[PDB]
Amino acid sequence: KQFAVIGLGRFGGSICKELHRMGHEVLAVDINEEKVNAYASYATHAVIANATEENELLSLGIRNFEYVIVAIGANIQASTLTTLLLKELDIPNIWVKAQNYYHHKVLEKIGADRIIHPEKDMGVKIAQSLSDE
Amino acid sequence: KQFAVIGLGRFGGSICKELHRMGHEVLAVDINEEKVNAYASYATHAVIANATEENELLSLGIRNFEYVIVAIGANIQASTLTTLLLKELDIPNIWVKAQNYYHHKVLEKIGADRIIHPEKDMGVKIAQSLSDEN
Amino acid sequence: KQFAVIGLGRFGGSICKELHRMGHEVLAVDINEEKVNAYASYATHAVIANATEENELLSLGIRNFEYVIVAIGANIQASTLTTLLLKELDIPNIWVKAQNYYHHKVLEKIGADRIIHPEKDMGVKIAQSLSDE
Amino acid sequence: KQFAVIGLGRFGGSICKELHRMGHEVLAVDINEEKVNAYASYATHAVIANATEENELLSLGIRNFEYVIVAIGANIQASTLTTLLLKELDIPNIWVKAQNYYHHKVLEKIGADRIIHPEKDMGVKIAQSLSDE
Amino acid sequence: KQFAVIGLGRFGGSICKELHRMGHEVLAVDINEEKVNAYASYATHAVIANATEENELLSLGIRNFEYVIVAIGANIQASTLTTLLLKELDIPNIWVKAQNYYHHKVLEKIGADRIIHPEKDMGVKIAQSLSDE
Amino acid sequence: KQFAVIGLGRFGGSICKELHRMGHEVLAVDINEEKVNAYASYATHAVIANATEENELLSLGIRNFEYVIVAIGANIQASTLTTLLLKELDIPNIWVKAQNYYHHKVLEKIGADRIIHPEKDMGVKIAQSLSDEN
Amino acid sequence: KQFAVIGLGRFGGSICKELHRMGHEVLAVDINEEKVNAYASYATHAVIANATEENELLSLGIRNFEYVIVAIGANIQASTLTTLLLKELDIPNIWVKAQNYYHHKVLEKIGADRIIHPEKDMGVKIAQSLSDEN
Amino acid sequence: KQFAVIGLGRFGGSICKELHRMGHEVLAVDINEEKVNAYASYATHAVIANATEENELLSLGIRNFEYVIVAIGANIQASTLTTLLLKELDIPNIWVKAQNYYHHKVLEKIGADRIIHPEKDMGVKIAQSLSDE
Ligand SMILES: Nc1ncnc2c1ncn2[C@@H]1O[C@H](COP(=O)(O)OP(=O)(O)O)[C@@H](O)[C@H]1O
Ligand SMILES: Nc1ncnc2c1ncn2[C@@H]1O[C@H](COP(=O)(O)OP(=O)(O)O)[C@@H](O)[C@H]1O
Ligand SMILES: Nc1ncnc2c1ncn2[C@@H]1O[C@H](COP(=O)(O)OP(=O)(O)O)[C@@H](O)[C@H]1O
Ligand SMILES: Nc1ncnc2c1ncn2[C@@H]1O[C@H](COP(=O)(O)OP(=O)(O)O)[C@@H](O)[C@H]1O
Ligand SMILES: Nc1ncnc2c1ncn2[C@@H]1O[C@H](COP(=O)(O)OP(=O)(O)O)[C@@H](O)[C@H]1O
Ligand SMILES: Nc1ncnc2c1ncn2[C@@H]1O[C@H](COP(=O)(O)OP(=O)(O)O)[C@@H](O)[C@H]1O
Ligand SMILES: Nc1ncnc2c1ncn2[C@@H]1O[C@H](COP(=O)(O)OP(=O)(O)O)[C@@H](O)[C@H]1O
Ligand SMILES: Nc1ncnc2c1ncn2[C@@H]1O[C@H](COP(=O)(O)OP(=O)(O)O)[C@@H](O)[C@H]1O
């Protein structure tokens, strides 16, 4: 019921739209103003903020959210830095989207609860569908 | 048992590796020679060919394969052109990886059996996992 | 007499201006509002619409037009998608502007009556002019 | 019979291929080595040279050629500078490919015998074909 | 008394300041807003406009000015295009600042009354001062 | 008759060419070898040397030259360092080309006999020409 | 006890914080207002001023300070010009942070009591630590 | 006696020169060929290699070296990735140069034995020198 998604892109935006359809309260935060306006109606709360600043994260109230999904793409440093800040806020579950194998290793060692690799993870279940078909 | 994957990238390469682990015969075709060499051991047959040429597709024997997966990325025209050629070869099932919404619409109307959107489709099942995780 | 041009750019805009001079009824449709305003006086009907939506095409009345020219440039997917929709509307003649060799092949197989390659096609007639000169 | 084409791109390359088919001697000059290698078999003489340097132009023997076509694209300064050098070499006929309206005006005033606008010029003859059809 | 300077840079700004000290009416036009604000007090009229647009030049009233100095630097195309527009406005005297030898040749042939090369022209008078010293 | 120009660029090269035309002996020194070769015929003596090294300056014989012009551009530190070395060699007249206002202040306080600002100084005489023309 | 630091950056800011911890009176001057506000609590006196203007330096009272540290970075001309002004104010000890080898030479000849090269000087003591660590 | 320095820049190059003077065997590795040539005489072994590739690190023999100093600057990802690879090679002591506070935190959590901040660390000892003076 209490979910937060950081980064409204192809992967992050899809999570907000799907969660909103199921009837869940989702907080969407993104630096780009156009992304927040587009997903303003698809999220319970839409915020234009920078996730790499610890002062803004406290203003949003991320510590309240049990699940935080960091879906920042094409900016690996922002994704790595955001998750490191979230552990200081003792977030119980942090789900991070990885970009490559090296980024996957860094996120694992800095304390990411679950690492998502949308291109690689989709292949291993498309292949599973082929066997079942 | 008879699968063909076109385009050995992040999405296409993952399918070949996973299918090979399960014990399936997979044909891997890619224009780039480095990709084919890397996945030569992970595929039953690895071929360096261009999927946009109908003469090369007949040489491989794609008509034999019941399932063909077009995993070409960052080259939308090659992905669109390859699937159009495959329908001429009366391929029963063609699975195509889409890049954006506009590419999804084009593939649907040209006769793609199943369209895959790895970034968008993963989000709708990650969100499903969140609900099931309470 | 009944012509429709989709995409008011360097190639599409030149067709509307030349046809208007000859005294022909031309319908101009383009997503960009500035392009439609600029060519509003150079076309019998100017419409701000998206050619990739089949609902808007029926509103314009494209099925009435015998000749439809798809002059969309720099957006290959929009050009490919528009021509595929037009064949559903049983348009007799569809002329499409191609961007590269791969786009030329796709348009040919999806049922484009005539494919135009302005950069390549101009070279083969400039060269012809050199021989005649 | 004696033609020279400068810049082996979409427009320049099409002229060399078409002239070669008709059986004409064409000299192809381009800074990029890949372009010259690709069109080496499609031109009687292929040269890797920079057209903005007056010393290299004399080495090629451009003054011998009666017709010189400057098909440099995406580099307006190189196209403008090349044609200015050619007039010093008293080239009888110089055909230049223009990029926009402002480039068309500059080429006209610096002494270009014929200015070609492939995107705009193709539209005025596609529109003519529509009327004749 | 009636002077116009286009481009408020190191060379253009120095002309406005020196002319203002001598008691002359100078119109300063520049695209950058910071440059116009800095030289607003050093010019009789300061305008934020683009010199490459013929519509804006007529609004300023450049045709009234007998002397127009085009001091645009680091943007050779803007400098070349601006002077070509000014000749359409039948400006009696046009003084242009050149960037290199090739730019000097282009400006001379498009009808620049006087071409200024601040780096090169200063050397020929510093050397003259050495002989007189 | 005895002039030395350091830095063969747009400003430094113009001084050597103009002085050579008037019939003066000019020594041209520059780190770049292409610049020295280009201006070898336009100078009585052309030398490929670094002006920031005091050992090379003595080899050239700069102390003999009464007028030394430091026309180094785009390298403010080299221009500032060269003029500081020249004062140790008790050069009577040192003319330096400045790059900006801050560089003008530094050169003035380190003992530059005359500071030249080609972009700014040309404007104040172009403006003077406008007044005399009207 | 009487120290002045000019330029509140990575190097200048570290000096003010460390001196403040030890219990010393430090004057911090910087053109940027955000830097002065950030280090206002870490310095006894924080001033927003330009060090290249001799009128502002007298207002601060730099002549009173025995030690002045010029930690201006990325603006070599400001660093060079500031130290030249300080010698006119007969400052006993002037410590300057250098940017490169050429800037090091200029500062040495204009009368800098001690020149600091944080990147180079840290390497020669990290290497010393390696030898002592066996 | 057995030291390896990765990245021949202002900080890395100073370590190699100082260690070479003291009479120590230093291996210098850098992607840039000019840096390796300049420091070839100042290091016992100079190698042109990429530290982000685990295959090249084994070729050099980094596992033999007890002390490895990662002095990569202006490329934070290369510095972070290199140190992560070194821990797989069970390097006893790894000294890393940090760029900012956020990079300092990441290196600390991924297992850097000692983190060096040349700009910040020099200030705390210059200030110490002032008190002692
Ligand atoms: N520091 C940041 N804080 C919050 N959101 C960010 C930050 N940096 C980037 N983003 C957002 O993350 C999104 C990443 O999208 P993109 O790079 O297109 O790949 P994807 O859509 O797969 O995530 C961007 O839309 C951007 O707005
Ligand atoms: N015409 C083609 N025929 C076969 N394979 C192709 C063709 N064009 C591209 N490919 C392959 O498809 C792959 C696409 O990978 P990429 O663009 O990185 O995205 P992804 O890894 O998500 O597929 C490339 O590795 C390339 O080798
Ligand atoms: N989906 C669309 N529907 C209608 N018009 C479009 C669409 N997408 C782009 N266009 C128009 O097509 C034109 C293409 O112009 P451009 O890309 O500059 O190349 P060209 O001028 O050669 O056509 C654009 O001006 C744009 O307004
Ligand atoms: N200075 C030059 N001299 C000769 N050829 C050039 C020069 N600059 C660019 N070219 C060539 O001109 C060609 C222009 O092609 P491009 O910019 O793709 O547009 P187009 O194909 O329409 O000409 C390039 O392939 C380039 O190799
Ligand atoms: N299209 C334009 N119209 C008017 N002013 C322009 C235009 N383009 C550039 N300028 C101005 O011309 C000035 C050129 O300055 P710069 O490039 O620094 O060299 P300089 O100072 O020697 O002229 C810039 O400050 C810019 O504001
Ligand atoms: N340390 C040095 N000693 C001698 N000459 C130098 C030194 N550094 C640079 N130069 C020369 O000074 C010239 C400066 O030219 P440039 O930077 O193009 O501006 P300008 O042409 O206006 O002087 C360069 O051609 C360079 O060869
Ligand atoms: N003229 C000046 N007077 C005073 N302070 C200055 C002046 N110019 C720059 N500074 C300050 O010096 C600091 C230099 O910091 P920076 O360039 O980041 O490198 P570092 O942090 O290593 O010193 C800047 O924060 C700036 O505020
Ligand atoms: N992947 C890499 N492997 C090895 N060396 C690298 C790599 N990336 C950068 N370097 C080297 O590290 C050096 C960093 O220097 P620089 O960025 O100037 O800052 P500093 O001199 O303070 O280290 C560069 O000279 C570069 O050659």
Coordinates of C-alpha atoms and ligand atoms in Angstrom, one line a residue, chain A residues 6-13 29-33 35 49-52 71-75 78-79 82 97 99 118, chain B residues 119, ligand 1:
Chain A
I6 CA 12.3 7.0 -7.9
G7 CA 12.9 7.8 -11.5
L8 CA 9.9 8.0 -13.9
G9 CA 11.3 6.4 -17.1
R10 CA 10.3 3.4 -19.2
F11 CA 10.9 1.0 -16.2
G12 CA 9.9 3.3 -13.4
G13 CA 6.9 4.7 -15.2
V29 CA 9.9 11.5 -7.6
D30 CA 11.9 12.6 -10.7
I31 CA 14.3 15.5 -11.5
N32 CA 12.7 16.1 -14.9
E33 CA 9.6 18.2 -14.7
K35 CA 8.1 13.2 -16.5
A49 CA 13.0 16.4 -6.5
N50 CA 16.6 15.1 -6.8
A51 CA 17.2 11.8 -5.1
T52 CA 21.0 12.4 -4.7
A71 CA 14.5 3.0 -11.3
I72 CA 17.1 5.6 -12.4
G73 CA 18.5 4.8 -15.8
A74 CA 21.3 6.1 -18.0
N75 CA 22.8 7.8 -14.9
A78 CA 22.7 8.8 -9.5
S79 CA 21.4 5.3 -9.1
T82 CA 20.6 7.3 -4.2
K97 CA 17.4 -1.4 -11.4
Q99 CA 22.4 -1.2 -15.9
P118 CA 15.1 -5.6 -16.9
Chain B
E119 CA 11.7 -2.6 -20.0
Ligands
LIG1 N1 19.1 12.2 -9.7 C1 17.9 11.8 -10.1 N2 16.8 11.8 -9.3 C2 15.6 11.4 -9.7 N3 15.3 10.9 -10.9 C3 16.3 10.9 -11.9 C4 17.6 11.3 -11.5 N4 18.4 11.2 -12.6 C5 17.6 10.7 -13.6 N5 16.3 10.5 -13.1 C6 15.2 10.0 -13.9 O1 15.3 8.6 -14.2 C7 14.8 8.3 -15.5 C8 15.7 7.3 -16.3 O2 15.1 7.0 -17.5 P1 15.9 6.5 -18.8 O3 17.3 7.0 -18.5 O4 15.2 6.9 -20.0 O5 15.9 4.9 -18.6 P2 14.7 4.1 -18.0 O6 13.5 4.7 -18.7 O7 14.9 2.7 -18.5 O8 14.8 4.3 -16.5 C9 14.8 9.7 -16.3 O9 13.5 9.9 -16.9 C10 15.1 10.7 -15.3 O10 14.1 11.7 -15.3

